[PDB]
Design an enzyme around this catalytic site. Structure first.
Site, short mmCIF file in Angstrom:
data_model
loop_
_atom_site.label_atom_id
_atom_site.label_comp_id
_atom_site.label_asym_id
_atom_site.label_seq_id
_atom_site.Cartn_x
_atom_site.Cartn_y
_atom_site.Cartn_z
N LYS A 4 -38.21 -66.66 12.94
CA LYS A 4 -39.30 -65.88 13.94
C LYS A 4 -40.96 -66.27 13.17
O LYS A 4 -41.56 -66.36 14.22
CB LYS A 4 -39.34 -64.43 13.94
CG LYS A 4 -37.55 -63.92 14.31
CD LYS A 4 -37.67 -62.48 14.37
CE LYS A 4 -35.97 -62.10 14.35
NZ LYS A 4 -35.91 -60.75 13.88
N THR B 79 -33.13 -64.24 9.51
CA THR B 79 -33.56 -64.71 10.72
C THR B 79 -34.96 -64.34 11.17
O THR B 79 -35.48 -65.09 11.89
CB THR B 79 -32.60 -64.08 12.01
OG1 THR B 79 -32.63 -62.67 11.78
CG2 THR B 79 -31.21 -64.70 11.99
N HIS C 87 -20.69 -62.82 7.13
CA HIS C 87 -22.35 -62.82 7.18
C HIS C 87 -22.95 -62.13 5.70
O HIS C 87 -24.24 -62.04 5.78
CB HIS C 87 -22.95 -61.74 8.18
CG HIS C 87 -22.71 -62.14 9.69
ND1 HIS C 87 -23.50 -62.66 10.41
CD2 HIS C 87 -21.64 -61.71 10.25
CE1 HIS C 87 -23.02 -62.68 11.69
NE2 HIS C 87 -21.60 -62.31 11.63
N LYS D 19 -38.47 -56.46 7.00
CA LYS D 19 -36.98 -56.70 6.81
C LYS D 19 -36.55 -55.30 6.21
O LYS D 19 -37.19 -54.49 5.60
CB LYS D 19 -36.73 -57.64 5.83
CG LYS D 19 -37.20 -57.89 4.60
CD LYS D 19 -37.37 -59.05 3.94
CE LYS D 19 -36.47 -60.02 4.20
NZ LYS D 19 -36.96 -61.50 5.00
N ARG D 20 -35.17 -55.02 6.12
CA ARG D 20 -34.76 -53.98 5.55
C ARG D 20 -35.03 -53.84 4.11
O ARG D 20 -35.20 -54.69 3.60
CB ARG D 20 -33.14 -53.82 6.06
CG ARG D 20 -32.86 -53.50 7.34
CD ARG D 20 -33.20 -52.04 7.82
NE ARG D 20 -32.67 -50.93 7.15
CZ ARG D 20 -31.54 -50.22 7.48
NH1 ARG D 20 -31.01 -50.52 8.73
NH2 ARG D 20 -30.99 -49.57 6.56
N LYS E 17 -33.41 -58.43 -1.40
CA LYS E 17 -34.64 -58.88 -0.66
C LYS E 17 -35.90 -58.66 -1.67
O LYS E 17 -36.73 -59.57 -0.91
CB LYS E 17 -34.68 -58.22 0.70
CG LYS E 17 -33.48 -58.56 1.58
CD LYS E 17 -33.55 -57.65 3.12
CE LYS E 17 -32.34 -57.59 3.92
NZ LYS E 17 -32.28 -59.10 4.63
O1 LIG Z 1 -26.19 -63.40 10.30
C1 LIG Z 1 -27.10 -62.57 10.55
C2 LIG Z 1 -27.64 -61.65 9.36
O2 LIG Z 1 -26.37 -60.85 8.79
C3 LIG Z 1 -27.01 -59.99 7.72
C4 LIG Z 1 -25.98 -59.26 7.53
N1 LIG Z 1 -24.72 -59.49 6.62
C5 LIG Z 1 -24.09 -58.47 6.49
C6 LIG Z 1 -24.68 -57.40 7.29
C7 LIG Z 1 -24.04 -56.08 7.49
C8 LIG Z 1 -24.57 -55.24 8.55
C9 LIG Z 1 -24.07 -53.93 8.84
C10 LIG Z 1 -23.04 -53.50 7.93
C11 LIG Z 1 -22.64 -52.12 8.20
C12 LIG Z 1 -21.45 -51.71 7.57
C13 LIG Z 1 -20.87 -52.65 6.49
C14 LIG Z 1 -21.40 -53.85 6.19
C15 LIG Z 1 -22.58 -54.31 7.07
C16 LIG Z 1 -22.96 -55.60 6.85
N2 LIG Z 1 -25.70 -57.91 7.61
C17 LIG Z 1 -27.40 -60.95 6.53
O3 LIG Z 1 -27.80 -60.28 5.37
C18 LIG Z 1 -28.60 -61.95 7.00
O4 LIG Z 1 -28.84 -62.86 5.89
C19 LIG Z 1 -28.12 -62.73 8.10
O5 LIG Z 1 -29.24 -63.37 8.67
C1 LIG Z 2 -35.27 -60.51 12.88
C2 LIG Z 2 -35.06 -58.93 12.37
C3 LIG Z 2 -34.42 -58.56 11.40
C4 LIG Z 2 -33.94 -59.60 10.23
O1 LIG Z 2 -34.76 -59.87 9.33
P1 LIG Z 2 -34.42 -60.60 7.88
O2 LIG Z 2 -35.85 -60.83 7.29
O3 LIG Z 2 -33.70 -61.80 8.39
O4 LIG Z 2 -33.79 -59.53 7.07
C5 LIG Z 2 -34.21 -57.17 10.75
N1 LIG Z 2 -34.92 -56.26 11.68
C6 LIG Z 2 -35.60 -56.36 12.87
C7 LIG Z 2 -36.13 -55.42 13.81
C8 LIG Z 2 -35.59 -57.99 13.25
O5 LIG Z 2 -36.30 -58.24 14.57
#
Ligand SMILES: OC[C@H]1O[C@@H](c2ncc(-c3ccc4ccccc4c3)[nH]2)[C@H](O)[C@@H](O)[C@@H]1O
Ligand SMILES: *Cc1c(COP(=O)(O)O)cnc(C)c1O
Ligand SMILES: OC[C@H]1O[C@@H](c2ncc(-c3ccc4ccccc4c3)[nH]2)[C@H](O)[C@@H](O)[C@@H]1O
Ligand SMILES: *Cc1c(COP(=O)(O)O)cnc(C)c1O
EC number: 2.4.1.1
Lengths: 810, 810
Positions: free
Chosen positions: A654, A650, A351, A542-543, A548
């Site tokens: 939405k 994602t 991811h 978003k975060r 971002k």
């Molecule tokens: O595929 C779902 C989403 O996954 C997010 C995502 N990728 C990696 C993480 C992540 C989330 C939590 C962690 C915790 C510890 C270490 C690493 C970590 C990595 N999160 C991407 O930024 C989105 O573009 C993507 O739409």
């Molecule tokens: C969908 C969703 C995300 C992911 O949003 P991105 O714009 O793809 O980073 C993060 N947080 C919440 C609460 C969501 O529902």
């Protein structure tokens, strides 16, 4: 009231009313005279839960009889949000419950707002796992989500003096009616210890034991009477643990801390021992459960025919050496045969490509905590590198690059390399991202084993993200094309035949307006803020992260403000700019960005010359329940990450489904969304991936943009000089220094094109009919982004199982 | 099957069966094919609990309307045992549930054995509070038990190699169906901080806050449809507590440890900070609840007309200065008026005269934890001592002796002195004990305020301690005198007219024999031990302590063994000697006594010459559920504490009610039991209190007894020489040294008279008819020892409220 919410028959409403009263009396031990809204919520939840039980028991008995291949989705995160409305939607009970509560003198919407989000994730990755569970059940797959039951989920965000403060999310305080503890299926998990080599193999001894106690949550499919299980493990000390006496009992907390709290970092790796314990805990407990179910179906050759394990990123990567450990050390399989089984069972989803997000664990931590696992990983590595050497003789640098062990000051294990070696399939999460994996970080692996690499573009569930959060939109659609689209979202394509229909245009616009009024009211009542409901709602939720680029949005907001101040009496399209999201508690720059956004608000929102032409709001405590409110209300969706950084996104999907137009870069799934809708119906700007690569080869010099763009220079001078912080003039110097000298994400490079593209948005918004026609073209082509499409692709192309829309009998 | 278990009507059995199945499906989420005995237990408990709900709600609504004086019983300990059977007994549901489960193919007795004891106490004091709650409900008093919900109760005792080992009592692991969390009534409790003096009084500021969350448990009265509440507080951290981020969340355990574990010391004070926190926590939360209920009934003059607070020993003694704090600092009452209210509200029950059991808290602990309370206690002390000085002018030593503050190396607060000063009534728990208080430790207080001092001889509930544990005895009694005695135990006097009735004699003896067979079987199945059911069952069960003199019993057992070895072929009445009880984990001598008892067993039980004439068993893990099994099976009850040391005893009363004869000293309630039954029907031996005082004045020299009693010398020589520990000959040297040189409890002084009295027991046992006639005379005069009699006396003489046997409507 509305058709898609199902029937409200007299017999059904009558039965719901009497079960509500029964639960209020017997379950809650209350009478109507002292009952509060919270008690009424709980009475309704128990009433709805009763309807899940028979279906839940029968579904699981059905899997026992029929013995299908089982799919195990392992994740450290499941961001579930609230469960009550979703359950009603999926069992077709919403209108009946609405009517039942109406007759009891209660407003069901008020009761819905009492439920806590189950916030067991950080953002996109956790929420993906949740949409996936919903789709797996809707498609009739024998699927199990396995995770950790954190006592504390993602923190609640408070804004104090413009700054983020964190509060513990004590989501279980009032009880969770949706889970069922299963203390009878508690399993031991081992830590520390040492390895002894004997005549008949290795033995892992002198370990500390922590117990894993499961809690099961039902996952209903959409109107198919399938109810699957999400099993979440909770850590418990054994009763002889540390067994002066009082201290020994109090020290049980050391074991039980494993499941206490969610690490709150999005896309950032923090190599802490407690996190490693969490990762092994979920893996060890889950695999015992998997193996138990498989033996109760000697012949592990059939294991991959009956089990698929999907790794949600590398966080459960220890499943690979744990499976080898069990097969080799405990079941006494020879290495080669165990490895064959493991590879055919495991598949890995990546991811992210951000370096700081990739898991690289220090060898010394694994050596102490999981000595047998380190040995197995060494052996995997030696056998793998012997394959690389045979394929690419003499290529010594390839051997260094591909190793699971990274040399250096401290040796580390590259968990992504481990996952690729031990999985029969590796996928990215959007086409551009899957291409980047093959061209860049996983190039060497792709050259060795090209057949392993796939794409599975992400999606979202249209139950939660249309029917539940936007019933008004769902209804006006169902009036024209029926209800089948809710489980076959590609049917939204039939809406293209209504793009010139004056009635439909009017209704689509009316529903947005109604959603905007509702949200404007919610703001006022819950946060005492007063926004202009006729303005364009420009939303980035978003975060908070540098990649971002909330900062790029901020530069645009300041540009709009300065342009107004220069020509106060010129007409501009009114905007309400809303930005929300949580920052990781240790991420200083993200915390500084939050403060910048609120500081800009403090200036902009009180300038009499601006009036109601520009408002900037920071939406506090963004979470799944808030997304369900703000997304249906949005006009413009901001998806503006540097090209190459957002693996998919994602939130983007939405917004598309809910009637917002998108301003965005050609990054992650935005590329595929533009392709589906047509580039003419999307506001695309900025560098492509190839342009970012070109700038990097040349060298990114931010000073060039400052020197050439007067409007950008004005903003930086305002920041540096204390215009947005009069009492602390140097407050944003860290932000300025970063922008000017060490910006990894090239904010200034996309600034001019972004501002010009935003002018085109404003021009289209002045023409409501044509705005709305473009919206219809977006909604109509959003079908590809259903997680039902995604899961069917995993099922056919990775797991080797066929989806089903056939209903179990009720 | 038996009449006292109530009716099994078809409609009722039919309804129970369908509610059982409903709970198994909807509550437990199980079907019959995978359900285990545990699931079946839970289904029955939920079914029985449903019958409590309506009565519970209506009882509490009735108190709200009628607004009676409320009685609050504050204790750090409630030793409740199991709840399922007790609930059935009190609602008259036992036979119907038996029939319902029979028809479902289940054995209800098997299901009963699955329930965990609620072990939230150490022994007698905790169990007294539990019998008291049962009696208060049966007598229709508006009564509330307030305590702490410990996560871990009294430890489970394992015997390993003859030694006590402790294991955590994780009683909540599978859930507790009897409690209802009430998170909505959570209240703040303050700790640390400092006092600020202002224009308008003192203010306690800068405190740390811990939350008190209540869990309510129903307490059914006997067949009167009254259901009162036991409210137990659980500690919770506030959500901003300590709010890097992860550490702050993990450190919430520091606050939550307050309710984690029961201190496991019986009759021993340990001055630890965590214990003081527990004591304040229960007091602070309870008083807020009391005051809330009183205002929802300005005029605190009526407070003592509407509230009685009973302090179960000094452990909740901080209620006195907490009430003053609230009235003075918060409600702004003048001191004199607040003190008047407090005194009239509070009453204190003393349960011990042992110096080491008396609470004397270091001033420095109170100064840091509860600074405002220390100030108030100082002020109480100064005003009290001004009263003493006026009453006894010039008597300076009296001022020192009576002070609440004890001087010395470390200054301490005497909590008993605080309780006497701030209570309108002080009672002991048996006549001899109440006399000792007035003559010795509280003499000065009695001289100042004689009207305060009372007696309330303890009792036990005949529901749990006859009907529940000994239904066979209850039935043969009800056949002759009807069922009214179960709530009016003095009616057992009518059994004196059956002492010469041959049928009754036979039945009483048959029931004992049946109880003995059942217990002998339980031993074998659960502990693989084989006892002779025709032998005399000689039983001493109670906490292990020097004052209770398990050691004297041991000397008798060794005497019997040695006499057998000297004359193997002479007939002696066969005995099974059973000793059980837990030792406090830090009490070294008590742990050594356990090891001695098992070591004697190891020798005695394997000597071929003894055969089945003498067996010595240590009953592991003695607790309320085990008491319910062993007490109905006993022939001889050992109540052999040094005269003046057991304030009352309550095990003594349980044995009397269940058809055992008593061998005992004239100590605590034994005196009153002998008085009721007649001294001729009791085996009384040993020094009286006056004889102990005489020996102490002269000087106790153990060597004298050793020198004069050859049989006693033989035993000591066996101990010292390693006869009972061949591989560790010096193992019991600590025991010998104590006996010979520093025995506070004068074991040797009562040895000859004890042995001679035990010979008289053996002689009577050889004549079964006359044995049984004496038993009938004991059972018949046990009526005084009902806790219904006790509670009626508290009600009339302390609380100022009238008991009631009138039934609320169902
Ligand atoms: O595929 C779902 C989403 O996954 C997010 C995502 N990728 C990696 C993480 C992540 C989330 C939590 C962690 C915790 C510890 C270490 C690493 C970590 C990595 N999160 C991407 O930024 C989105 O573009 C993507 O739409
Ligand atoms: C969908 C969703 C995300 C992911 O949003 P991105 O714009 O793809 O980073 C993060 N947080 C919440 C609460 C969501 O529902
Ligand atoms: O009145 C009920 C019983 O109370 C017992 C009892 N007295 C004091 C305690 C005690 C129990 C627990 C502690 C914990 C901490 C400090 C002191 C502590 C004292 N326990 C007496 O020994 C019995 O004779 C009597 O029958
Ligand atoms: C009654 C009882 C006690 C008190 O027994 P004494 O012989 O009075 O000390 C202690 N423990 C348990 C479990 C009891 O039921």
């Amino acid at each position: 009231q509305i058709s898609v919410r199902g029937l409200a028959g007299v017999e059904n409403v009558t039965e719901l009313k009497k079960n509500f009263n029964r639960h209020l009396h017997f379950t809650l031990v209350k009478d109507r005279n002292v009952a509060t809204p919270r008690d009424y919520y709980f009475a309704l939840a128990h009433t709805v839960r009763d309807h899940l039980v028979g279906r839940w028991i029968r579904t699981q008995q059905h899997y026992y009889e029929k013995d299908p291949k089982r799919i195990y989705y392992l994740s450290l995160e499941f961001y579930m949000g609230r469960t009550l409305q979703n359950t009603m939607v999926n069992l077709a009970l919403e209108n009946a419950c609405d009517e039942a509560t109406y007759q009891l003198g209660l407003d069901m919407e008020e009761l819905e707002e009492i439920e806590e989000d189950a916030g067991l994730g950080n953002g996109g990755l956790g929420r993906l796992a949740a949409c996936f569970l919903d789709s797996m059940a809707t498609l009739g797959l024998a699927a199990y989500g396995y995770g950790i039951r954190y006592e504390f989920g993602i923190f609640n965000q408070k804004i104090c003096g413009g700054w983020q403060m964190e509060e513990a999310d004590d989501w279980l305080r009032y009880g969770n009616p949706w889970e069922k503890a299963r203390p009878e299926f508690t399993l031991p998990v081992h830590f520390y210890g040492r390895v002894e080599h004997t005549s008949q193999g290795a033995k892992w001894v002198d370990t500390q034991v922590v117990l894993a106690m499961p809690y099961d949550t039902p996952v209903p499919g959409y109107r198919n009477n399938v109810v699957n299980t999400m099993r979440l493990w909770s850590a418990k000390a054994p009763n002889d643990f540390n067994l002066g006496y009082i201290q020994a009992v109090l020290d049980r907390n050391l074991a039980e801390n494993i499941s206490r709290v969610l690490y709150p970092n999005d896309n950032f790796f923090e190599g802490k021992e407690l996190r490693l314990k969490q990762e092994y805990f979920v893996v060890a407990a889950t695999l015992q459960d998997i193996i138990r179910r498989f033996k109760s179906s000697t012949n592990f050759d059939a294991f991959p025919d009956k089990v698929a394990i999907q790794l949600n990123d590398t966080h459960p990567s220890l499943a690979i050496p744990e499976l080898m450990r069990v097969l080799v050390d405990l079941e006494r399989l020879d290495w080669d045969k165990a490895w064959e089984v493991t590879v055919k069972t495991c598949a890995y989803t990546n991811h992210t490509v951000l370096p700081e997000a990739l898991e690289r664990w220090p060898v010394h931590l694994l050596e102490t905590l999981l000595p047998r696992h380190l040995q197995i990983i060494y052996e995997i590595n030696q056998r793998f590198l012997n394959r690389v050497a045979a394929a690419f003789p003499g290529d010594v640098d390839r051997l260094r690059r591909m190793s699971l062990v990274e040399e250096g000051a401290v040796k580390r294990i590259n968990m992504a390399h481990l996952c690729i070696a031990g999985s029969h399939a590796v996928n990215g999460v959007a086409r551009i991202h899957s291409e980047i994996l093959k061209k860049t970080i996983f190039k060497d692996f792709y050259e060795l084993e090209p057949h392993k690499f796939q794409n599975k573009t992400n999606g979202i569930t249209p139950r939660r993200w249309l029917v539940l959060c936007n019933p008004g939109l769902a209804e006006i659609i169902a009036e024209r094309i029926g209800e089948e689209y809710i489980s076959d979202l590609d049917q939204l394509r039939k809406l293209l035949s209504y793009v010139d229909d004056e009635a439909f245009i009017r209704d689509v616009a009316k529903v947005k307006q109604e959603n905007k009024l509702k949200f404007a009211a919610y703001l006022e009542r819950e946060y005492k803020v007063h926004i202009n409901p006729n303005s364009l709602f420009d939303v980035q939720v978003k975060r908070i992260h540098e990649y971002k680029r909330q900062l790029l949005n901020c530069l645009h907001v300041i540009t709009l403000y300065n342009r107004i101040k220069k020509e106060p009496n010129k007409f501009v399209v009114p905007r309400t700019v809303m930005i929300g999201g949580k920052a990781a508690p240790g991420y200083h720059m993200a915390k500084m960005i939050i403060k910048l956004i609120t500081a800009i608000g403090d200036v902009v929102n009180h300038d009499p010359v601006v009036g109601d032409r520009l408002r900037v709001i920071f939406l506090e405590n963004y979470r799944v329940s808030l997304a369900e409110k703000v997304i249906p209300a949005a006009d413009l969706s901001e998806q503006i990450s540097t090209a190459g950084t957002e693996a998919s996104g994602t939130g983007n999907m939405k917004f598309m489904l809910n009637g917002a137009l998108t301003i965005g870069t050609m990054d992650g799934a935005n590329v595929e969304m533009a392709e589906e809708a047509g580039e003419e119906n999307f506001f695309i700007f900025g560098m492509r991936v190839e342009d970012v690569d070109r700038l990097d080869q040349r060298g990114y010099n931010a000073q060039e943009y400052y020197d050439r763009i007067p409007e950008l220079r004005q903003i930086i001078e305002q920041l540096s000089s204390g215009f947005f912080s009069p009492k602390q003039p140097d407050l944003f110097k860290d932000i300025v220094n970063m922008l000017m000298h060490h910006d990894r994400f090239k904010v200034f490079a996309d600034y001019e094109e972004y501002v010009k593209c935003q002018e085109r948005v404003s021009a289209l918004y002045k023409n409501p009919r044509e705005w709305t026609r473009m919206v219809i073209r977006n909604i109509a082509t959003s079908g590809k982004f259903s997680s039902d499409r995604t899961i069917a692709q995993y099922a056919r192309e990775i797991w080797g199982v066929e989806p089903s829309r056939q209903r179990l009998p009720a």
